[PDB]
RNA sequence: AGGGGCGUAGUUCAAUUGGUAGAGCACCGGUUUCCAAAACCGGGUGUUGGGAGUUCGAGUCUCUCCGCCCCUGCCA
RNA sequence: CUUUAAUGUUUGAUGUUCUAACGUUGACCCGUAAUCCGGGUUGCGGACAGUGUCUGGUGGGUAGUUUGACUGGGGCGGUCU
RNA sequence: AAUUCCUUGUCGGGUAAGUUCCGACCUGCACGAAUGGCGUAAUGAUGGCCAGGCUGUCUCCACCCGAGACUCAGUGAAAUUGAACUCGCUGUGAAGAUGCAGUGUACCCGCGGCAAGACGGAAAGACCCCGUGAACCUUUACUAUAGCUUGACACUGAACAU
RNA sequence: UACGGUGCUGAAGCAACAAAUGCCCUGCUUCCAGGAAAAGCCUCUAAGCAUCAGGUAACAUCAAAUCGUACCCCAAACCGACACAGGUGGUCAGGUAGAGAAUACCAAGGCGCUUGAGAGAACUCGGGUGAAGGAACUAGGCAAAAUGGUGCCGUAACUUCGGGAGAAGGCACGCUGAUAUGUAGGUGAGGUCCCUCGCGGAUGGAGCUGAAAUCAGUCGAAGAUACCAGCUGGCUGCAACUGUUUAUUAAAAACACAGCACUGUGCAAACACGAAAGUGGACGUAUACGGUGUGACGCCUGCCCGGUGCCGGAAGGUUAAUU
RNA sequence: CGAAGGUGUGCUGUGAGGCAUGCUGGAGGUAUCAGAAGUGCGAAUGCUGACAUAAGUAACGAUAAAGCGGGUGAAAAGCCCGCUCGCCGGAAGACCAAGGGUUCCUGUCCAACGUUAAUCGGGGCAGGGUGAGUCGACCCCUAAGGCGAGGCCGAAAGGCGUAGUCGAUGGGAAACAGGUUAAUAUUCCUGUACUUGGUGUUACUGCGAAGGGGGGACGGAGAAGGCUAUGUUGGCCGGGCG
RNA sequence: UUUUGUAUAAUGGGUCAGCGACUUAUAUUCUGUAGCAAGGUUAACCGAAUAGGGGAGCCGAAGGGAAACCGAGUCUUAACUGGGCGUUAAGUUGCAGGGUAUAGACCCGAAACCCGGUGAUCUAGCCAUGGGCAGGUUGAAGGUUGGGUAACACUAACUGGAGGACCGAACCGACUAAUGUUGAAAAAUUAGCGGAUGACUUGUGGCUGGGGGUGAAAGGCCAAUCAAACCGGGAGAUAGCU
RNA sequence: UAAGGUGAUAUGAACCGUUAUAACCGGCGAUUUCCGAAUGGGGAAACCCAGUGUGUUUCGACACACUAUCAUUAACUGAAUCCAUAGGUUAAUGAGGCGAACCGGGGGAACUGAAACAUCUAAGUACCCCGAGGAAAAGAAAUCAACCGAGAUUCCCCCAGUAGCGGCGAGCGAACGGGGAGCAGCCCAGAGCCUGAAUCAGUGUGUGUGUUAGUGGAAGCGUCUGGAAAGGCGCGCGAUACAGGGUGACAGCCCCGUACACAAAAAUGCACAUGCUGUGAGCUCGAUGAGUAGGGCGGGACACGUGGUAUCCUGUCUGAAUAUGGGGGGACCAUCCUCCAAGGCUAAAUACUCCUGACUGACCGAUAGUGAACCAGUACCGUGAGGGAAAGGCGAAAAGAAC
């Protein structure tokens, strides 16, 4: 499903407004993209379904550090 | 049941 | 004149039988309701 | 019947819409042609349907009255 | 100050060429007894396509509703201070 | 004319007599060319009209054969029903009277029949109207919205040329 | 001997002809719309065994479990609230007449339909017949009556040459005899030849079966005698047609239709169903697919781009998020 | 020594009521003054039950048709037996599938059920009855389709789908005739067969796959030919002399 | 009952018996009553506990002004001789009752909207696999053999067996009329009628689900219900109407 | 515990017991077919079909056991591709489903009200889905206050229908503060010096108190009416027992009980103590949660509907300071107070009752009370989901009527 494997972002629901404030139910989905991340330690490419916000944290945190948290989370990358 | 007898005065 | 009921044991069991009802949760909720109500005959199977 | 529109030169139409009515054709007169026409020059034409009211003043504004158009008169 | 000629800079506008993201409902290999899927090799495309947020346009495709009253029945006509 | 209001348009054919039909006329209220026009053999439980045959369709009904209806025995419903000792007439009267007034008539009670009335029975009227009722449907009614489409940013980088 | 029964005995048990919709036939011929799968079964070798195992063949032998099996099954037992004039798939298919599984009468077999008995009114239902007239009835020939078979003769406008057409209209039909005592035809024994020999071939014609036609005679009012079994013709509107539709008041001129045209769509197709994946389109590729309108065929389809859509253009005007 | 309740009677108050009694019944009832209410019914085409009305009226379910003798019985138009008559006979006969579930057979009974009576019944009651290597099902095999490891996708639920695994209405081994029970039969009995596996013996010996190939394996229409089921006639056998 | 008005021929009721509709909670105002009184009274809670404790708070004794503020005054205005609102007048807490408010709010009754499920054993379409269509006609293409042509073309005869072809049973449809209309039957029967080798018909399974399906298209059909199925829930929806 | 007993309709038959192996009651075990998460495969639930292994032999077979999926962990093997990795095969644990309400979270209406109707209301309600517990959730201040101070969370009464929100309509509706119920605080983001300290979790070991069978339990006679006395009329007695029920009409003394006094082989709850197995207490010095806070855009949650709107959550795009520093104090700034987010844990007061026991009612008394006082979620109806009834009383004793 539409779940970020790093940040855990999932679809959320909200309202479409209007000039008359009419409210209709809608959904907000993450900007998910399948990317092949190069993990140096295994000299391999591992594919992750990440959001655009998740991509930013990967550079800041390091590829190895995030995966360590993922193994603790048991997400089965 | 029934079917409204079309003895209808229009 | 042919009416709405044409008996067919194979069709009846495949449509409303115990295994057909219990295959899905919605049918399993029918069994849960009939168990809660205390029905003598849970499903249509003999 | 009821409601809207219309009546302006000889025929078809502009109108200004309170203070002095034009255009096209037709008609008349004169050119041109052997002659008619086509063409050219010049020009006269109107109670503005009828009446009664307003207004200093009405073809124009108001109301009836004639004539001619256009719409409606539907549900059981 | 104007006119500004040139000067670097900072943003953009196209065009061209790349590959490395991304695409492949191209080929081949393996998982594999498999027209799925995944991985690998390669080719093609390529900073497009596609997707997310925001945003302009369009949208009876689909919804939620409105569409007055008086009236010698109602509608039409007329009327509403 | 599946289209013509006036209208049974007018003329012709068919009939003794034809508001229909057929042929023309054109004055097309308000036909018309793929929301097709005009024709067209065949086809049609297709619509209209005419003729022959044929007949109880009818003039005008008669008889007969069966099944009910009628009588007897057995079994044994239903819709409906305020209560009834439940007549005519004229008038009155939520304005069409078995029930009021006046008057007339009528012994008590079945059975077979006919349906004029009991505003007969059936079903909180379908037409009409109303409610600031419901639902579907239409659109250049209103407000939205899926979808489609546009651009910015992100996924998304490099070099060069202007 | 208990109407049953039980026990014993028990003749002939052949041929010809006719003949299927069954079998050969999952064949043959032909056509376009081009007509499952898998396993059992047969065969082939890999790896893994090739002394073994395993395979083939012949005997002997074991095993073949479990569940259904009554009865109804076009109906009183199923579906219709009913012992309900309804509905319900397959198999079997006797005799006479007949083209026939139509129809009439019968066989095998099964039934008389679970209130009757009287009476013999009106009226109602289902039928029969009808003087005379023959659509005068009625919205309307509604209904009824009538036509009805085979063979032969004959048959118009019109036509897309197929039709129209069974057009219309008419004639002959029984029975008996003769041709010919039981014909033509079909079937076909015995016998006689031939065979590299059999469920054989060629002759051969016995015996069965058997129309159709003609002639002569004969009966009746009537010979397709019953049942069964087209009414016909003329003009015209609409739709070409076969078909489809409002189960339960509308079967039509409505829908569909072949054909025609426009338009979209280059295949990761358009489009559609799906929050998405995917699927259909299509295992198709513009001679294809989707959508729209028209609706065979024949002769044809004129003028308007102002309005509303669609398509193309992009210079300018205006204009969102953003900055 | 007769409470409530019910049913009469009498008295009494302006009224809703009250008091007392005779009978019924057979065990509860309750003054007074306060307190609390599911506190008072004729109607709502009110709800439930009971009972009327029409009314001993309509109807008693295809116009295929009945009649008689005898029997059983308390009782016979309806049951049993017999003889006639009539109806179906491409069905109104026979055998199945689907579906029903004992309605099948026998004994016994007539309250209810049967549109009447009923001795009868598909009614009540009690017994009995369904016998398979070959018929089916199960089993092997697949169609449409369903489910679906992993997988892909999706707020969750879930959706789709691969390998697979299910799913006949189709494809796959084999039995016929005769006899017999009140009710079953290609199942039981008699007679005569056949099939697929297991095991063992003997002889001869290349076997072998989730793999390959063949086969299974397939339309519509039409045309005959050869046949059988079956029928007819003759012959034969038995019986008949009307 | 509803009305200006009903013996009304306007609605309601066949009858009896039973049941059946102004309630409850909280808050607020008013009246009555009781207590205390310029004061009255507690709530939660504690508590052997209907006591007592708890004055947290609430109302009242002072108002005016938008407010700051002032205060028996105050506001307005620059200011009022003014004017508005106030100042002599007992309240408060229980209990009962009359109203109001929020809840279903006196009871019964919608057509509908929304949510989650159940249905394609009927019917519509489609998919897979099987079956059915007596009999009798018409005689296409093609083929053969002639006649004709240089070869065709063409023509004749004979073979052939084409068709949403013809007549007509089964089968399927349902056009007309009669009956039937509390029926034999909640759509049929009888006599006729159309199709009847096909766009046919049928058996057994399967698939498509409710704003959805399916539809040779009628708003038809989707379990006797369809201009939005059925079941349960929101729900005692709402009902200025009866 | 016992002199009676083989459940009920429901008799009968044949028997078993009587002083303790009848029966009955309780604790702990044994057995526990088939279906069902159903788990060897399949399936039209209660049926069909196996595989492996051990052990049996009458050579026909037979009896047990194991064989689902997923998650986690560990071994062994094992591609493209040399290592590897994916994948594959075993073995251990754990999970699957059901169940009333309450709880947290993910989604989320409409009717209705506004006398119409869009914002709003209904309502974060109904419903769907996920997860957990006996409670859950929340919870140890980047909180409030206001220059005085308070000191986690939850719940009740006030504050108050106030301040505010609102087509400023309908309506919605606090907080501060106060009174109560109940109170409890800690750990990591790191290393030493001490040392096993406190405390917690496992378990045994006793005590105490329950729970799951039980034991004893006081005291009346006469007469009258009457079918029968518990009633009438007399005369007694018990009471820590006059709560109730039954007994032929109304029983303190007839029976069962009640008040009191007692009881446990075995299992188990709770609490205290104690022993082991883990568990670390204290001191010093450090460290102080970054794609986070904040911001732009779009929404949502706070009573607060974008409004001048603080605060909280974030789909999107950005992005700090970091104790010499940050957050909040309802736009915003300064000053001043107060606190230290971006890591966690935590009992009590609170909500609910499918179920167990006892007791209570100005609650019902067979059309009432649960739909059901009765073999009721049954009969019956519907393809199905689902809907859903009617029906109690002989008498003291059946003595249920011999003939
Ligand atoms: Mg109308
Ligand atoms: Mg709309
Ligand atoms: Mg609404
Ligand atoms: Mg009005
Ligand atoms: Mg006319
Ligand atoms: Mg004429
Ligand atoms: Mg004409
Ligand atoms: Mg036209
Ligand atoms: Mg045109
Ligand atoms: Mg056109
Ligand atoms: Mg037709
Ligand atoms: Mg005609
Ligand atoms: Mg005639
Ligand atoms: Mg009368
Ligand atoms: Mg009278
Ligand atoms: Mg009168
Ligand atoms: Mg009479
Ligand atoms: Mg009569
Ligand atoms: Mg009459
Ligand atoms: Mg109105
Ligand atoms: Mg039998
Ligand atoms: Mg029948
Ligand atoms: Mg019926
Ligand atoms: Mg029945
Ligand atoms: Mg049939
Ligand atoms: Mg026949
Ligand atoms: Mg008669
Ligand atoms: Mg008649
Ligand atoms: Mg006749
Ligand atoms: Mg006669
Ligand atoms: Mg006559
Ligand atoms: Mg005559
Ligand atoms: Mg006439
Ligand atoms: Mg006449
Ligand atoms: Mg006729
Ligand atoms: Mg006739
Ligand atoms: Mg003709
Ligand atoms: Mg005409
Ligand atoms: Mg047609
Ligand atoms: Mg119809
Ligand atoms: Mg039909
Ligand atoms: Mg019809
Ligand atoms: Mg058309
Ligand atoms: Mg244009
Ligand atoms: Mg243009
Ligand atoms: Mg009482
Ligand atoms: Mg008395
Ligand atoms: Mg008694
Ligand atoms: Mg009451
Ligand atoms: Mg009353
Ligand atoms: Mg009655
Ligand atoms: Mg009688
Ligand atoms: Mg009568
Ligand atoms: Mg009578
Ligand atoms: Mg009668
Ligand atoms: Mg009968
Ligand atoms: Mg007799
Ligand atoms: Mg006969
Ligand atoms: Mg029985
Ligand atoms: Mg019998
Ligand atoms: Mg009797
Ligand atoms: Mg019986
Ligand atoms: Mg056998
Ligand atoms: Mg068996
Ligand atoms: Mg077989
Ligand atoms: Mg899976
Ligand atoms: Mg699937
Ligand atoms: Mg299988
Ligand atoms: Mg089969
Ligand atoms: Mg049998
Ligand atoms: Mg062929
Ligand atoms: Mg033969
Ligand atoms: Mg009346
Ligand atoms: Mg009435
Ligand atoms: Mg008071
Ligand atoms: Mg107190
Ligand atoms: Mg105070
Ligand atoms: Mg003053
Ligand atoms: Mg009050
Ligand atoms: Mg009230
Ligand atoms: Mg045909
Ligand atoms: Mg035909
Ligand atoms: Mg009639
Ligand atoms: Mg025809
Ligand atoms: Mg229907
Ligand atoms: Mg709707
Ligand atoms: Mg409902
Ligand atoms: Mg509600
Ligand atoms: Mg209601
Ligand atoms: Mg199993
Ligand atoms: Mg409203
Ligand atoms: Mg627990
Ligand atoms: Mg004791
Ligand atoms: Mg920190
Ligand atoms: Mg924001
Ligand atoms: Mg503002
Ligand atoms: Mg505002
Ligand atoms: Mg804000
Ligand atoms: Mg941020
Ligand atoms: Mg009673
Ligand atoms: Mg009740
Ligand atoms: Mg009850
Ligand atoms: Mg009762």
From Swiss-Prot, chain A:
Coiled coil: none annotated. Disulfide bonds: none annotated. InterPro entries: Ribosomal_bL28, Ribosomal_bL28/bL31-like_sf, Ribosomal_bL28_bact-type, Ribosomal_bL28_sf. Keywords: Ribonucleoprotein, Ribosomal protein, RNA-binding, rRNA-binding. GO terms for biological process: cytoplasmic translation; ribosomal large subunit assembly. GO terms for cellular component: cytoplasm; cytosol; cytosolic large ribosomal subunit. The keyword RNA-binding applies. One of its GO terms (molecular function) is structural constituent of ribosome. Part of the 50S ribosomal subunit. PANTHER family: 39S RIBOSOMAL PROTEIN L28, MITOCHONDRIAL, LARGE RIBOSOMAL SUBUNIT PROTEIN BL28M. HAMAP family: Ribosomal_bL28. This is Large ribosomal subunit protein bL28.
Swiss-Prot record, chain C:
Transmembrane segments: none annotated. PROSITE patterns: RIBOSOMAL_L34. Part of the 50S ribosomal subunit. This is Large ribosomal subunit protein bL34. GO terms for molecular function: structural constituent of ribosome. InterPro entries: Ribosomal_bL34, Ribosomal_bL34_CS. Keywords: Ribonucleoprotein, Ribosomal protein. Belongs to the bacterial ribosomal protein bL34 family. It comes from Escherichia coli (strain K12). One of its GO terms (cellular component) is cytosolic large ribosomal subunit. One of its GO terms (biological process) is cytoplasmic translation.
